[PDB]
Symmetry: D3
Subunit: 237 residues, 6 copies
Amino acid sequence: YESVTVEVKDHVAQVTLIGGNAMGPAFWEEMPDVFGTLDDDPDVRAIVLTGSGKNFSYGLDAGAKSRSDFHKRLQKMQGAITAVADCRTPTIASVHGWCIGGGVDLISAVDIRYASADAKFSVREVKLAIVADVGSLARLPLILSDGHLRELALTGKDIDAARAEKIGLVNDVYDDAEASLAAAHATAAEIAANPPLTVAGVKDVLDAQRTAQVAESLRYVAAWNSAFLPSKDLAEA
Amino acid sequence: YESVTVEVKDHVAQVTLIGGNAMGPAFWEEMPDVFGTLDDDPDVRAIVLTGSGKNFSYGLDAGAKSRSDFHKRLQKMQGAITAVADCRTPTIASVHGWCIGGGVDLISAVDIRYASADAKFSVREVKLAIVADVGSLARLPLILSDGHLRELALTGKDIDAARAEKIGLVNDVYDDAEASLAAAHATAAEIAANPPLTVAGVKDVLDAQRTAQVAESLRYVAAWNSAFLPSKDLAEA
Amino acid sequence: YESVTVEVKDHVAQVTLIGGNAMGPAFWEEMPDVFGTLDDDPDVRAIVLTGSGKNFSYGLDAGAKSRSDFHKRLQKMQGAITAVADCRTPTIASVHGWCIGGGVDLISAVDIRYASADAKFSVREVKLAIVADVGSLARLPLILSDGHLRELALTGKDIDAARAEKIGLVNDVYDDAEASLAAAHATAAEIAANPPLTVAGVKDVLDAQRTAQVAESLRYVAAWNSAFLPSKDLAEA
Amino acid sequence: YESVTVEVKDHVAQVTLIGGNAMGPAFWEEMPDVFGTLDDDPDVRAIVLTGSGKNFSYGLDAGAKSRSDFHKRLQKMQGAITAVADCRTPTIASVHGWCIGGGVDLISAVDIRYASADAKFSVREVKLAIVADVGSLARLPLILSDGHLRELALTGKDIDAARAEKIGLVNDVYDDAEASLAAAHATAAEIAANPPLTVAGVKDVLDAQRTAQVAESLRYVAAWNSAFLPSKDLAEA
Amino acid sequence: YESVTVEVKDHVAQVTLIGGNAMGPAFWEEMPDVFGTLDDDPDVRAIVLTGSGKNFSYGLDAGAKSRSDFHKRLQKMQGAITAVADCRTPTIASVHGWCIGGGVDLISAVDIRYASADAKFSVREVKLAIVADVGSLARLPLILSDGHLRELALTGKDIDAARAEKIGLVNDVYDDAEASLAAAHATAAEIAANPPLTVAGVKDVLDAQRTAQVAESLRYVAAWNSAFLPSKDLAEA
Amino acid sequence: YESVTVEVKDHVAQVTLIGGNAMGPAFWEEMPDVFGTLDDDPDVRAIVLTGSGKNFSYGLDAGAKSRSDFHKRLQKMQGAITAVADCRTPTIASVHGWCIGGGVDLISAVDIRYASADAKFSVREVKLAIVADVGSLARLPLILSDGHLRELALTGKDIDAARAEKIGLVNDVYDDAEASLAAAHATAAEIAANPPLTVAGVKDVLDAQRTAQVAESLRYVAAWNSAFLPSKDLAEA
């Protein structure tokens, strides 16, 4: 693969994103294949997801006929993330550094989130004159509450790891990158020491409770952005 | 009023549309006031709705900033049609002649439908390069079934009163234009001889079963039409 | 049992109601016990339901503290009718004569309905100044369509077996009572020659599709009738 | 393609199934690819579906680790039919002869159904000691009503084209197998003479109204059959 | 306006309630018009809501025919509160002092809530022998969790700003009234520097996720209170 | 009773479970009658629930015909917890010591939860090769959030009272057992001094918001466990 690295050891695979880890066309083309490959063979029972370098990611790098094609690309981009959100092997994210835009759309589709002390988070589509349509606003309501989500989505500001700990976006915070990565690996091993059919069944039962809302919200946002996205304020900044 | 006539006699009001009865800008501004006035005073217990002349009706007479205004403008036409479907006084429609497009969107919001032998029906928006967004496809699934509705909406053909009787679009068919109007008045007078407070409660209980899906379908169709409506095929015919 | 008779033969039980078959306190008291007894033992694989005599049935024979008791009574009667609709043994009804009010609430909970040529049907609560709250308006929407149901519920009139067959309320019509009872027994015997677990599973899968809306509608109508039922027009007739 | 034939001529493609017309592993493997190919190129605007020969089709030809593989295989076979039910090019079926079991699961996923006078239909899974789990019971509720569906699914009998016309399973009935195949082509050409970008939008809006309940019913039936299917009565016949 | 004051300066309007700020008939009559005026002007991009004096607010100041008028009268208060929650201009509340009864119902319909150290909150209808029916129990479940909501609604006690901040009712707490009002103005000015169409679209997408449940809960509570509200315990205190 | 003790004083009944309080067949046979008795008589207005000894509880301790009996038995076990979750008298739990497995399923169905400093909580079904199907994963999502729920359910670890306080599983923590029991009694006495028909109405309105999803999740988990529960890994530990 030209956008990630995969290394498996002792029933846990680690998956690293190498690209400031910007997500381009190769990302959207490749993620479903990587996660389908990892979720098939029985040698893997849990996955750890981390980013290369000193950050996690920076985000993303007319008439009806031209807008239909935009609609189709937007749907494919949505499917690339729904691929990770519907896998039956548990995933743990380990976040160090910066996490902007599309990266936030990615860590809202994993099961567990660990951070370090120098981590910063934002949802910065509104500052670009964009209404986010990849999965942030469809899946963040199960993680956060109304007021914190509304402030984050309407202001476009940055928050640190202590506030993200307090509002519920991450489970734990540690001093450095290596401590958080070790904690994530310890939890992954703890999960991999259980029976695998029972784990997949728990995941199935929990996922059966939330699919319709996410699908409906994604449909509506694709239509809205196909209507109102391209404008002058998109070029004004 | 500049678009209808109202005449009340012995607890039933008759409401006639006078414009071939095409529905223009005055229609969408005037209908909610007429139906709010009729549904308030206690002297009226049922309404009869018919069209003037020899027909019922003939139907309807860029950047983000203009499409926003188009969106807000579509929503208020939707609300004008929703006004009739939410009042608590029963309505009976008596259909004579031709009934094309928007008129079909109007008779799908009344309680009872009667016809005569010279009546013709169509949903002819697809032939205009339009996806209908005023209420037909959101309310028509409770009246018809999947195959009949799907053929009508995808072909754009005309059907006669016998087939409309068979498929469930009208309740009864009669020989001439005056027998149907007499039958509609007989049924309205039958309804107006029951306790007025039980009838509105039956309407309330029956309407509580169907509002959410209609509202959701209306939202989605407004968003779709704000994006894909203006095209070359709209000008091609 | 002081309100029914039960006789089982060759894996089919026949259940007759002996009271013009009007149903009173014993009906609601003891129906769930009868149907729970019949749906337990393996010797019974289908049930036939018919009414004694020349008809099927004729129907039913302040401050907050007094209205709470009415609310609980209404819920109890609703549960007595819901008992029949939730058993896993199929039931076939055979209707001769008259079917008024609560009887219509009863035959909308069986799987199959057969009639004869001398049969008459009505939903007559509106003429009593009542909004029906035992299960007719919650379950008739899956049997009929919107316009026929609205006419029946708002007018309060009687219809005969030909119109009932046309609109979908019954499956077949026959010349006399004995022919219809024989047809019902033939179909019940046809169902009782299939594997029993497969039949109960088909029933379970089909019932899992409709329970929530029925329960919601029943809740709302109980609250509405506790608020608005006792009035002067109730005593005016 | 070892299970179908495809021939396109003047914006309509005809797709014939050649295997009686039993549906085996090649069918489930190949069905999504044909419809993916036909929905891609713009040279095709409507599809006609018919069966080879003198009939339409005849149907289909432990511990936890053993049941899991069955569960996955059942899901894949469900997806093969959901592929046809979710394409944006309209399809018309033309039915001559016999239509048994899985074939009924196939014609409930097309838009329009035409028949001839020698056509016979059944849902025969219950006679095999099977609860159908490919799409019949999840999609037939939008086509039929409660009583007719319940009789068909619980008895396992066969019906002719007149009763299927009257209950709503087909739109029209013709005298021979060659008149229906020409009526279907006339309708397909009528659809293909409309603007191609409005037809797909109408389909999209109509499909947004029904997907969640179908998906839920399919999930539940897969879980039920993974538990109760393998038994003695399956081997007893 | 006789119940509020409005002053706009640099794209933010401040709206103050002047009545201990108790809300009466003028409040319910005039509430929708103020927000209709403010949400339509293009010179306003965010709103700040604060209460006059040393507190925020103190709350609110038979046969079927009288119950009907009570029912229609309750629905208008519900609509007056729903007007604020459906506008497309963001609102920030700033709470100093006391917040009792209907005051809690009002601040559960804004986007963001800020408090000071001398603030006290309660839901006190249960101590009046009332089940709250103006919007608290329908919208408060998205803000809080199950146990905290149940304790607050069943006991009727007062809580201070520290516990409210912990349980998620407010975002931030400050030392005095002026600090909180300055913080609210800073956040409003931060929101008013983003593109306005993007902000309104984010609001629309987020609101499309919650409307049906709120509407259903409001219907049910109106019916329940029309049935059971007037009693002796209402006069006993 | 052979599994609990009941003692009523000053309008509050205390209910103690005496079996390390393991829950056996007598528990599932007896709980519905115990709770039905207390919710009927008017002398009781609130209930306190605590466990005997030094802990709260330790939890609980083929072909289609055997699976069917297992399925019915699982449903009967679910009904005993649903009995507690659906009564109209408020309940307060007071937790001391250990709380493993089924005990957690019991405390996710009460209104309020109090703890002491030596309390420990877990969901250990996954470590037994079981997917929990008695009501934990169906009701626990209204109490917690996604990440904490997924960690608890997928790892099978123990947590202490401080972390349970932080994540929202309990409302308050106290130093010893007697302090928590006294706090629970003080709150119950506070609740029992309000009007009794307003408290039950608040409970009814709040419960109308959540029943359908709980019922659906329970159905699905019963089917899944009937399919995949008995295996070798169940005997491997």
